Amino acid sequence: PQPSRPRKGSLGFGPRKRSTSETPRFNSWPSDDGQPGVQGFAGYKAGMTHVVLVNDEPNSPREGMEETVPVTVIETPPMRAVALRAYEDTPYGQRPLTEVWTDEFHSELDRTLDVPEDHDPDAAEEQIRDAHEAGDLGDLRLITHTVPDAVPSVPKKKPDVMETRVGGGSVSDRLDHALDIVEDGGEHAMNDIFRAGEYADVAGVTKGKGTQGPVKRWGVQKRKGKHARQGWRRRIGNLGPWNPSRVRSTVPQQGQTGYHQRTELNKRLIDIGEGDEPTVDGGFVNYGEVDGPYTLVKGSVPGPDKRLVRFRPAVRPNDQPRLDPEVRYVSNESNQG
Amino acid sequence: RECDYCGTDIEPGTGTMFVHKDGATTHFCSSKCENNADLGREARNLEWTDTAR
Amino acid sequence: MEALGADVTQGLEKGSLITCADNTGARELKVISVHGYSGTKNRHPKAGLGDKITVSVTKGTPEMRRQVLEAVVVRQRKPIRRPDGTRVKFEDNAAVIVDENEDPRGTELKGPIAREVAQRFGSVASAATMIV
RNA sequence: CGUGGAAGUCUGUUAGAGUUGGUGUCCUACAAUACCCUCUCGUGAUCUAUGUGUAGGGGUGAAAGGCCCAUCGAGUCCGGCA
RNA sequence: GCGAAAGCCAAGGCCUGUCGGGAGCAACCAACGUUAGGGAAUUCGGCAAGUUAGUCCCGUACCUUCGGAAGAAGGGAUGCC
RNA sequence: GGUCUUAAGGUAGCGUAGUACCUUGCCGCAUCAGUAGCGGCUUGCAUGAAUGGAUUAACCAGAGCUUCACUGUCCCAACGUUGGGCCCGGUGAACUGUACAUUCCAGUGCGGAGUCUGGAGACACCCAGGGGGAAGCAAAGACCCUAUGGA
RNA sequence: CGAGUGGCUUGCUACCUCGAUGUCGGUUCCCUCCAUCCUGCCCGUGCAGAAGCGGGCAAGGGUGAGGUUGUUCGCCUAUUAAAGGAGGUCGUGAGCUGGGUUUAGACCGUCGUGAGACAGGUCGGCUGCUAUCUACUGGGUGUGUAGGUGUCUGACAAGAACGACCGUAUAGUACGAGAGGAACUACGGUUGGUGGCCACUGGUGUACCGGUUGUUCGAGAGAGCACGUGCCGGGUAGCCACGCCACACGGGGUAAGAGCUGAACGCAUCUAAGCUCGAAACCCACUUGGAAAAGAGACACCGCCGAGGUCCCGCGUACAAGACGCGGUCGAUAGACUCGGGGUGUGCGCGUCGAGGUAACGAGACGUUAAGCCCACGAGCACUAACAGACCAA
Numbered sequence A: 001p002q003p004s005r006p007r008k009g010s011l012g013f014g015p016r017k018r019s020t021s022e023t024p025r026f027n028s029w030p031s032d033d034g035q036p037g038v039q040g041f042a043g044y045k046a047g048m049t050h051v052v053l054v055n056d057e058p059n060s061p062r063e064g065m066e067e068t069v070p071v072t073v074i075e076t077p078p079m080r081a082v083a084l085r086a087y088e089d090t091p092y093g094q095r096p097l098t099e100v101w102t103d104e105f106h107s108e109l110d111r112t113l114d115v116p117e118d119h120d121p122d123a124a125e126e127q128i129r130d131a132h133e134a135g136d137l138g139d140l141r142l143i144t145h146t147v148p149d150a151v152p153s154v155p156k157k158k159p160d161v162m163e164t165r166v167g168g169g170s171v172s173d174r175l176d177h178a179l180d181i182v183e184d185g186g187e188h189a190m191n192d193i194f195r196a197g198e199y200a201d202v203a204g205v206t207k208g209k210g211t212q213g214p215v216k217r218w219g220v221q222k223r224k225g226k227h228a229r230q231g232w233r234r235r236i237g238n239l240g241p242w243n244p245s246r247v248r249s250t251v252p253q254q255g256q257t258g259y260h261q262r263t264e265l266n267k268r269l270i271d272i273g274e275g276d277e278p279t280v281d282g283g284f285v286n287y288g289e290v291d292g293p294y295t296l297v298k299g300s301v302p303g304p305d306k307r308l309v310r311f312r313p314a315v316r317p318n319d320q321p322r323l324d325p326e327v328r329y330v331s332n333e334s335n336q337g
Numbered sequence B: 001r002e003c004d005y006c007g008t009d010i011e012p013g014t015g016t017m018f019v020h021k022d023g024a025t026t027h028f029c030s031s032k033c034e035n036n037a038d039l040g041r042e043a044r045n046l047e048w049t050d051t052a053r
Numbered sequence C: 001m002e003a004l005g006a007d008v009t010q011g012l013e014k015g016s017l018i019t020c021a022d023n024t025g026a027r028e029l030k031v032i033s034v035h036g037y038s039g040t041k042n043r044h045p046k047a048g049l050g051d052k053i054t055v056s057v058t059k060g061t062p063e064m065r066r067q068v069l070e071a072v073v074v075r076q077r078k079p080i081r082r083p084d085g086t087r088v089k090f091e092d093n094a095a096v097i098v099d100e101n102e103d104p105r106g107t108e109l110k111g112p113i114a115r116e117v118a119q120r121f122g123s124v125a126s127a128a129t130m131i132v
Numbered sequence D: 001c002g003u004g005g006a007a008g009u010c011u012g013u014u015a016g017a018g019u020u021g022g023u024g025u026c027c028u029a030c031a032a033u034a035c036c037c038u039c040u041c042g043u044g045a046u047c048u049a050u051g052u053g054u055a056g057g058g059g060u061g062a063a064a065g066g067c068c069c070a071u072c073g074a075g076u077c078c079g080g081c082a
Numbered sequence E: 001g002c003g004a005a006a007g008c009c010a011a012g013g014c015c016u017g018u019c020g021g022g023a024g025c026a027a028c029c030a031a032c033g034u035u036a037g038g039g040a041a042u043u044c045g046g047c048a049a050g051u052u053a054g055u056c057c058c059g060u061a062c063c064u065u066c067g068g069a070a071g072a073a074g075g076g077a078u079g080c081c
Numbered sequence F: 001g002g003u004c005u006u007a008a009g010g011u012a013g014c015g016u017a018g019u020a021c022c023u024u025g026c027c028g029c030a031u032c033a034g035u036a037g038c039g040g041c042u043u044g045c046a047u048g049a050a051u052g053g054a055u056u057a058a059c060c061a062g063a064g065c066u067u068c069a070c071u072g073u074c075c076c077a078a079c080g081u082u083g084g085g086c087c088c089g090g091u092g093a094a095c096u097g098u099a100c101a102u103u104c105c106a107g108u109g110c111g112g113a114g115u116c117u118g119g120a121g122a123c124a125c126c127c128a129g130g131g132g133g134a135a136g137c138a139a140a141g142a143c144c145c146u147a148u149g150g151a
Numbered sequence G: 001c002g003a004g005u006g007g008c009u010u011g012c013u014a015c016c017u018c019g020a021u022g023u024c025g026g027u028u029c030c031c032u033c034c035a036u037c038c039u040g041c042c043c044g045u046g047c048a049g050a051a052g053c054g055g056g057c058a059a060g061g062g063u064g065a066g067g068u069u070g071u072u073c074g075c076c077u078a079u080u081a082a083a084g085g086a087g088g089u090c091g092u093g094a095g096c097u098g099g100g101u102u103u104a105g106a107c108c109g110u111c112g113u114g115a116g117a118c119a120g121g122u123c124g125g126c127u128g129c130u131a132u133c134u135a136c137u138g139g140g141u142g143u144g145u146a147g148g149u150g151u152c153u154g155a156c157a158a159g160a161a162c163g164a165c166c167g168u169a170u171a172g173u174a175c176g177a178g179a180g181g182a183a184c185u186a187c188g189g190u191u192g193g194u195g196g197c198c199a200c201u202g203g204u205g206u207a208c209c210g211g212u213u214g215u216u217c218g219a220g221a222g223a224g225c226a227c228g229u230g231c232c233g234g235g236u237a238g239c240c241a242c243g244c245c246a247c248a249c250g251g252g253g254u255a256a257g258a259g260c261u262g263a264a265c266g267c268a269u270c271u272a273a274g275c276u277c278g279a280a281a282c283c284c285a286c287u288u289g290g291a292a293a294a295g296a297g298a299c300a301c302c303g304c305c306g307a308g309g310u311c312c313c314g315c316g317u318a319c320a321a322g323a324c325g326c327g328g329u330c331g332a333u334a335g336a337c338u339c340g341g342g343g344u345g346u347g348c349g350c351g352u353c354g355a356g357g358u359a360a361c362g363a364g365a366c367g368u369u370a371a372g373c374c375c376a377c378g379a380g381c382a383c384u385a386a387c388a389g390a391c392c393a394a
């Protein structure tokens, strides 16, 4: 009677086209709870190595025992929050109001931006406060870039600019916190936002695989048995029925695979540190050597080596944070062998 | 741990452990060793092995 | 069931000829089904270490032959991943016949057993010679 | 036990003959019957060149209505014929 | 080497089974190699593929028109110096 | 039934058959499970003696089934090799074409519409793809009926 | 007995096509219906419990593997939460398959004088086409919005991004004479689906290294051929799955339903006004897309004689063309060299030994030698090549 079966692949990550920005853009942000802070950071993917841990989970029968955990190394040097953008609540959603910039700029920010020479940080700040008085101020976000120059293995010096949200206390107190970071030089580290043991959401633009067929793109079957030798190997049975006299967008077809934005949920930060403790012998294959500010994220992270990945505190965590896990051993053994 | 074939130190979180018919246990550091063992070769006879040198 | 404390890559399928690691009189067992399993279209139902399977006796004593009994997969050739990351593989694929109450039908268990089987089926463990 | 070396005998891509499956390749072809692998026969009722005989309601046919110049349950050409 | 067999090479012939250049050269297709664990669950059907293999020694069932079955099956051996 | 039609009235055998409608007949073998296969039974819709019956060693690119061995046939797909495919120079056809044509969901209509009616959607052009639709292309249906047709 | 709904079966009719709308079954891939098999929330019970039986709302998700048969259907097995049914030209042959029906060959049975027949059986018996239009999947080029760079907004669009099960504590407890035997909640894991990633395991790896057969280059050394690696052994990077990571809760409004207050109708009444609850379903949440949203958007800064861009050069985190991304001496972008990190497994030569042999000769063994050969990765390193320079632009 023709057995049932779920459709090949998900319709939720559509359309399967190339990403507009190689730098990921978050569409969701955490809720306003504790003390005001920047809701995210960023780094550059380095590679994978394993780490030995002590089981933190109270409900695990293995609590306190030795456990091997796969970890991805991401180089996370300090970022610079160059501006404070303000949004206003309009009958057409949220719209940007004004921006508060600075004087101190990183030597090579001009490779991406048309750096401000003449700006009024006071009149901008005034417009935001007069809007808060009116009860029209939406949320508070900071324009932020990365220092790829600080990362020797990444070829680019051209900074990856992206906006991040500041949430926390009252809208008045987080306006102050936001302006306070900017007015200095905008310098902040991963220690300022995250603590080892917390669950984070890692966004990334996947490994580009060009144009691929249905078997790889949608995971459909290959032609089986006698059908496999007839001249059709990796092509689906049909493009749809007689009626409707058209091909639906839901039928698995060929095209672009990879280079898509993916936001991978609930990623545990195993350790945040500095130096050469996680580097592999002979250097990370197709990347380089790690010596500086890093982050060890549990499991996989979207994208290849050298790519920019974004961080955010989990908007929907499953477990309660079990802070600063004990690290018994980090492997430095060559990835060649 | 040490490899029950070549004698080098098995990097923690790596390797395979083969269980024999009688119950005997043999830890291996890599597939290279496993395959050399399956060929009936004894670690003493191969020069690259830590047992030999 | 209770957590095995290891990740198993199923090495057996429906119709697989495996060994009977006991003194029941049954020599070769044939997998028919797996307890609490429900696959997907075209996929052959898979069985592995720690699974309670349903079996038919292919070889053995005239009395034990042709019988449809339940069993537990003790050993398997395809590697299983323990918490410390180490893989463990066996010489053969083996099972021990079990009754309704998850107790072994025979008295003596031939060959080694995995420590993971001990957590799920206790009276099979307390009947085992070697536990690896 | 040896000798002998019979056979519409056996194995065999020897030469040569044949054409089972792939229902592969091709299917505006390389080709109006092709290509590749697989397969059968291979001292005999064997295969083959050349010459020669049988002609259309007639031949030829170990018989399939097979074949008789890409033409066959009655060849082809022209005529009867507008 | 059993060989008018394979494979390799002479003599002799040829680069005219007659359009070329570029992309680590994607999807897809044609021929094809290797795939862990399982082992025909595939399918109308093991279709396709694979297995086996040469030589010598041992050994060989039912049945039989006594010719045959039969290389039955199964076991062992195999290089170089 | 314990002869009658029309001469005789199925003997040896074989039998659910390449012949058995009922039918997947019943029993058994075999498998977890066997409309299959084999053995037995067998009243045979509608077996049977040169319209040759039964049987059979050897032979078979003949039809069906079982086992060992084998394996990407399958679970379930991966990577690779060679020629294409894609881009460039040169060469250079054909199929097909009433017209218009960016469609889609409904409806209507000779009852199976890109073109009618209502709505919806729709900026143009170009590259690659696998073929959903044009009741796609290809051949005055080889089925069926009809012709005071043919062989 | 009576009234109907559907359009899956069959039958009828003969409206459509005979200058052809390819068959049945299967397969593959997509959407749907509800008359619901499972899962959620309910009501009744001949509801103690447990296991059921019947009914309501409900189409989110699921509904699987196999033995005979061409079968659909159906029979049978073991698993399962359950292994529901139906529509899409009895969905799907310019996708596959070709086992059955239904050509030409042949046999059997029956019928027939016979040719030959059969809504009887049986063996064999072919699968065409270079896509013009349209449709969708992905990729570009222009135009509109009316100079640029960077960051956003969110009209709308897509999602199942998650479904389900087993076990433990609750508990041998509630309930029950006993046998038997729950739940709320909290946890652990499995399965199916989904997205991604390669540290680990596994595969490939006609890169590479070794062994070795035949033959050829006189031997040696070192090589070629054996189908695109002769075969065998090992295998880096990358790509992969058989490997690994991740994939809530909760709100809001409802259905069936349980209720509150409450009148018509002094009472009663969940309903008529009003209100409190309440489904795996809906909406939000979350993920993806999305300035061509014609109301054609917002902010900041740079620039209108110069901001920025294109071509150019060195290259890939990108790639079928096109596109995208980075670097360009104020430089580590690529190559050479040297390290490091890796693959293989101990080089040629020489010395000793070597069963033997008068000697010649001698397979092979040990040493020299973690040797020799090799690397799709990293580092150091401006040595070499990123030069010269052209164009557009308010």
Ligand SMILES: CO[C@H]1C[C@H](O[C@H]2[C@H](C)[C@@H](O[C@@H]3O[C@H](C)C[C@H](N(C)C)[C@H]3OC(C)=O)[C@@H](C)C[C@@]3(CO3)C(=O)[C@H](C)[C@@H](OC(C)=O)[C@@H](C)[C@@H](C)OC(=O)[C@@H]2C)O[C@@H](C)[C@@H]1OC(C)=O
Residues within 6 Å of the ligand: D027, F138, F139, G020, G022, G127, G128
């Ligand atoms: C249905 O079986 C087909 C199989 C094959 O189909 C044809 C070819 C397809 C046939 O087309 C199909 O013919 C059927 C009789 C009717 C069918 N229609 C109902 C649709 C028609 O189309 C189909 C079946 O798709 C064939 C007739 C086409 C055509 C132009 O007439 C023709 O004759 C050409 C010279 C073809 O040569 C031959 C001998 O057919 C060639 C083009 C070759 C290369 O293509 C083919 O051979 C294909 C294999 O041959 C037909 C004669 C058979 O028809 C029947 C009833 O059995």
Ligand SMILES: [Cl-]
Residues within 6 Å of the ligand: A222, A223, A224, A227, A228, G027, G028
């Ligand atoms: Cl298929």
Ligand SMILES: [Cl-]
Residues within 6 Å of the ligand: C014, C032, C033, C034, C045, G065, G078, G079
């Ligand atoms: Cl099963």
Ligand SMILES: [K+]
Residues within 6 Å of the ligand: G017, G018, G020
């Ligand atoms: K017709």
Ligand SMILES: [Mg+2]
Residues within 6 Å of the ligand: A335, A336, A337
């Ligand atoms: Mg590696």
Ligand SMILES: [Mg+2]
Residues within 6 Å of the ligand: A337, B014, B030
């Ligand atoms: Mg390793």
Ligand SMILES: [Mg+2]
Residues within 6 Å of the ligand: C042
């Ligand atoms: Mg199937």
Ligand SMILES: [Mg+2]
Residues within 6 Å of the ligand: none
């Ligand atoms: Mg002649």
Ligand SMILES: [Mg+2]
Residues within 6 Å of the ligand: none
């Ligand atoms: Mg005839």
Ligand SMILES: [Mg+2]
Residues within 6 Å of the ligand: none
């Ligand atoms: Mg395999």
Ligand SMILES: [Mg+2]
Residues within 6 Å of the ligand: none
């Ligand atoms: Mg075959």
Ligand SMILES: [Mg+2]
Residues within 6 Å of the ligand: none
């Ligand atoms: Mg019978």
Ligand SMILES: [Mg+2]
Residues within 6 Å of the ligand: none
């Ligand atoms: Mg007679």
Ligand SMILES: [Mg+2]
Residues within 6 Å of the ligand: none
């Ligand atoms: Mg058609």
Ligand SMILES: [Mg+2]
Residues within 6 Å of the ligand: F140
């Ligand atoms: Mg006609």
Ligand SMILES: [Mg+2]
Residues within 6 Å of the ligand: none
């Ligand atoms: Mg006819």
